[PDB]
């Protein structure tokens, strides 16, 4: 249910 500084 989250994310991260992807490309
Ligand atoms: C966001 O960065 C995190 C660092 O722990 C992970 O590498 C995660 O897979 C990244 N999200 C995406 C969509 O690449």
């Amino acid at each position: 249910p989250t994310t991260t500084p992807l490309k």
Side-chain angles (χ1 to χ4, degrees), residues 2-7:
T2 169
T3 41
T4 43
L6 61 117
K7 321 305 194 89

